[PDB]
Amino acid sequence: QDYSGFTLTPSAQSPRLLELTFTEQTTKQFLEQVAEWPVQALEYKSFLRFRVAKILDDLCANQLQPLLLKTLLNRAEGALLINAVGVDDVKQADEMVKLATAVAHLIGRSNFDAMSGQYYARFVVKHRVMELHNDGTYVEEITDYVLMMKIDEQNMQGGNSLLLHLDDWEHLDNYFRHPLARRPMRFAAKDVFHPVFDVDQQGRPVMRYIDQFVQPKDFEEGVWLSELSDAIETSKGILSVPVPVGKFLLINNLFWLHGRDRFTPHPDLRRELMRQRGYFAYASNHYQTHQ
Amino acid sequence: QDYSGFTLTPSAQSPRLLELTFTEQTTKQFLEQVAEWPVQALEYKSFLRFRVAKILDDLCANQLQPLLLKTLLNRAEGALLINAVGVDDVKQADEMVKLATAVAHLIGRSNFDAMSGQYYARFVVKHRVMELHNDGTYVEEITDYVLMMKIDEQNMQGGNSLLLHLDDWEHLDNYFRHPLARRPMRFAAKDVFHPVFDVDQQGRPVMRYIDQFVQPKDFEEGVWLSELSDAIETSKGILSVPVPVGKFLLINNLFWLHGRDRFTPHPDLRRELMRQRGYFAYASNHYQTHQ
Amino acid sequence: QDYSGFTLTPSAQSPRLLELTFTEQTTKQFLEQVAEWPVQALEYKSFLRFRVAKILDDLCANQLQPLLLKTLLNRAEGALLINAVGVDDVKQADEMVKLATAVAHLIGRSNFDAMSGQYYARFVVKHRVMELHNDGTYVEEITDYVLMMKIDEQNMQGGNSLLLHLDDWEHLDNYFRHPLARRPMRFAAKDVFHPVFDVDQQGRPVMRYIDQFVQPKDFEEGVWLSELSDAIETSKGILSVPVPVGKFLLINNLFWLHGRDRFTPHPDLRRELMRQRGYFAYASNHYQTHQ
Amino acid sequence: QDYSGFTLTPSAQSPRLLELTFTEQTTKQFLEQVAEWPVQALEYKSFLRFRVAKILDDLCANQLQPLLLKTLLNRAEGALLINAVGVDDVKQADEMVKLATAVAHLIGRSNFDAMSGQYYARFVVKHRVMELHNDGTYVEEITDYVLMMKIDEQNMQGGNSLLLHLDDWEHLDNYFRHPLARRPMRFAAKDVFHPVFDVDQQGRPVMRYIDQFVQPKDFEEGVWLSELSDAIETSKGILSVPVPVGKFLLINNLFWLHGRDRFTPHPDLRRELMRQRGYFAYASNHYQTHQ
Numbered sequence A, B, C, D: 001q002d003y004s005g006f007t008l009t010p011s012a013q014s015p016r017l018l019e020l021t022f023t024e025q026t027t028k029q030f031l032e033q034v035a036e037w038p039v040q041a042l043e044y045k046s047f048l049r050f051r052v053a054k055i056l057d058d059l060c061a062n063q064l065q066p067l068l069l070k071t072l073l074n075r076a077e078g079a080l081l082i083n084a085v086g087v088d089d090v091k092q093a094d095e096m097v098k099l100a101t102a103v104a105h106l107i108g109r110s111n112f113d114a115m116s117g118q119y120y121a122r123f124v125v126k127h128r129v130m131e132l133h134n135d136g137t138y139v140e141e142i143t144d145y146v147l148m149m150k151i152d153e154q155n156m157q158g159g160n161s162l163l164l165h166l167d168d169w170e171h172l173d174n175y176f177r178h179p180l181a182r183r184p185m186r187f188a189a190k191d192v193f194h195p196v197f198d199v200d201q202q203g204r205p206v207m208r209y210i211d212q213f214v215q216p217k218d219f220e221e222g223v224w225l226s227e228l229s230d231a232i233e234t235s236k237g238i239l240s241v242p243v244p245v246g247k248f249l250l251i252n253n254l255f256w257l258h259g260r261d262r263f264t265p266h267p268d269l270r271r272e273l274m275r276q277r278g279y280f281a282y283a284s285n286h287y288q289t290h291q
């Protein structure tokens, strides 16, 4: 469908993953109206992350924020691949960070990243599969969204993002109905405890899993987790998604798992990524007390 | 008016800001009577900060402490620019620190400075505006006073101290009456929570704001804070105050915000500053219990 | 006796210490079936420690785990010296770690080692007695088992493992019946407090002692601890056990103490060790509440 | 008087300070019987500190411990200068540490020293007065004793230990009867709070004072502390005590303050000191409950 300032279309991998593209006109207006604040301004003054979010959404006739929220909160969807026409080269890395910042802070707030010391982190790669997982499993607070952007890509064969929506996982009911699915387990990167599975508000399964940080306490937990790992990694429901330079995935971390495919080692390989993770925060008609 | 040991006169920028000058006679007597304790003695033995405060006030026929307290506690004023005749060169930096220490510890105590590891900090600059703010917003305890002294100044164009008394801010009522004015927000440099506005004992607005450390949790808090920032930074009530070498500002941190103007980058630029921050502590007739 | 996949035989030092040897056939099958996961995979993904435990026990017709548990939990025994035919050279260090990992995680879980940052630690030596002690005395949680493996041994004269089963200690009753045996004392490597002696479920003495970390608070505690030390170190019940390359001791840390004999300083001496410590965890028929 | 293994005699500075000298026969027997444990053994295994204490006291026909306790606990005395005939050269530093360790652990236990990471600390000096103070004022637990030993002394003019018994301080009653004497104040090297004065079991004044770590909160506390400082530093009751190599002071930290006199800067100056601090612990007939 045609919205104000962007277009929206289902991906070739899955109707659950929608591709959102900001038009050139919208992109150049946004970059002009946020040229005043460099990325370092966003790092130091967090309210500016919300200011550039507003500018972007205002440029979309206030259609962007409700569309982002409806898509990410919809159990049937929950995943976007987002880009802006004309932003597609590593030389525009700062513009990429500004744009991703604006989109994220229309739907929530991005958390501190211990690896960068900022609300986002940039990584350079210069090659086996990264297994599917949820982020944020080793802290008490829930991470609702994962944002992963391709900043640069050179002589890169393979390395697609891997995605699995829990409602596409043919082994969901077998593992979810197991008693250990509800057992709180230790997670360590202070340790926290929570089960591998939980439920959303409607009783449907969500996951809080990563194989590196879950710490099975005994043989019973361990053997079950290793079968869970196999059952996830071999699932026929996994999506394999190219993420070209200037595109980013924005996914609901509760019922999507993500990872990364193997890629070819090449001497001149360069891949740059940018990540953000945070929680949802948005207005809705709902109950409160007092005045 | 003519006091004992010093003179007091309103500034050219504002009747709220008073200029206090210690006479040459008072200055040389003070420096003589405190020559026994170098600044390093004040760093190691905090009661000596109060000893040099007493010496200074005794040299003013005990008129200084009550004048300092009455001015800083007066909502109509709350700000002093203080100097001593004959102390005006970077070579007298230690004397400057002694004098500022004596003045501060007549009205309170200066807190530990994480940047220096001492009760004061000296910074050298060798250029855009520093936005108006209150100090101490990222800890639980209230900072009542900010003390900022010019130790050295070379080839410096611009860079005045910026000051804003809340009762000169034409947008006070619009932001203070907003519901978010009373919302406790997260501040981070352990995180603390408090609103951007509060009230003094008489119900009049005070502020605990800085754009770098306030952490809006969502789009609602963020957009409001960015408009607050604009409304402060563009206020026609801001004072632009030169602070010559050997002068220091001493302001009530609750209803004055402070910052620093842009200055010209110059290859041979040198500016040295000294800061102290602390809480008020003083005698008054008021109620207690027991014996 | 002849079990499935291994043999079991009493040691020459003591009927309490049993020697368990995996057959060549079992050893090569295990190494083949776990070749897919290098040691670094076990370091990062703890459930894999339980996966390789299962593979080993499945290769023993599920006779290994119950035998390990029955031996280690038996007060009359509680100690194993374990090896696999064909794994006996430092070049197979990784295979050694895999095998020891599999055995340990059939009976419990190995704890984080602050010296290595992993669930195990490797040390190289390149010479006086290490006194008998229990591990884990400076934390609140009980360490049930100590696993010590010889990875390499070159020009090594002496240095046997020293072992003492409390039921072989001729001074047990004299020290256990002393009031200070039940006095909680301070242990420090946050400090913890516990007595030097405790009891198992049947009222029989267990120990939580090491001379370096126990911190007697006064002359009374100190003199008694020094006599305890002498009484342990001179006990005629101590076993002196060679541990050849590829063998490991696996002992119940509650009623066995361990240490190390003096060895000859030699310029070309090389000794490599690997340790794991953890808690028991296993299935048994016992009571629970609720459903 | 003549005791078994040592002699005891009042000092030339004060009848409150007694000089205890171990005879040559006692000294050589002690060093022989503790030759088995080097100082590094005492650092690692704290009960050995009590073992060498016992050996020393046994060599004194068990007269040493009761004499040490009676002297240090006696309000009229509370201070010893201790030496052993034949131990008087820096080359015997380890022997000095052994001897001081044995004496201290007959009457208590020496605490961890953050400056050395051991139960004692050695410092080399290679020159103004160190003001009188009590140790341990910045932690919650009471330090009952300070032990200070001269390990080496070369081209040293001046630098006597300074001592003040509170019952020799002509200003005791004036400061003790002041309300601020009972005011808990902040001490910082987590901060602790306690008054400058307290009382012993009989209501007599004790002190917990040092000018560097006490943190007066305001002008009232500060001015009073500075007068207290003057009143202590100018007291005519201060003792000036040479401490030759191999001698150590052992004082009751509650009613003795200590410091150090000025000394002459000399290019070839070398002074080595060893300190221990701890709490009293000893047997006495007194009440308990239960069995």
Ligand SMILES: O=C(O)CCCC(=O)O
Pocket: A134, A135, A136, A137, A138, A210, A277
């Ligand atoms: O993001 C997190 O907080 C946990 C997952 C880290 C990873 O991506 O491996």
Ligand SMILES: O=C(O)CCCC(=O)O
Pocket: B134, B135, B136, B137, B138, B210, B277
């Ligand atoms: O002073 C503080 O404690 C907060 C403000 C720091 C600044 O001046 O930017």
Ligand SMILES: O=C(O)CCCC(=O)O
Pocket: C134, C135, C136, C137, C138, C210, C277
């Ligand atoms: O293992 C531990 O946790 C304590 C003992 C350390 C040692 O082997 O000396």
Ligand SMILES: O=C(O)CCCC(=O)O
Pocket: D134, D135, D136, D137, D138, D210, D277
């Ligand atoms: O010993 C302490 O714990 C406090 C005093 C330190 C000093 O001797 O200056």
Ligand SMILES: [Fe+2]
Pocket: A133, A134, A135, A146, A258
């Ligand atoms: Fe991730």
Ligand SMILES: [Fe+2]
Pocket: B133, B134, B135, B146, B258
């Ligand atoms: Fe400031």
Ligand SMILES: [Fe+2]
Pocket: C133, C134, C135, C146, C258
């Ligand atoms: Fe051990």
Ligand SMILES: [Fe+2]
Pocket: D133, D134, D135, D146, D258
């Ligand atoms: Fe001291």
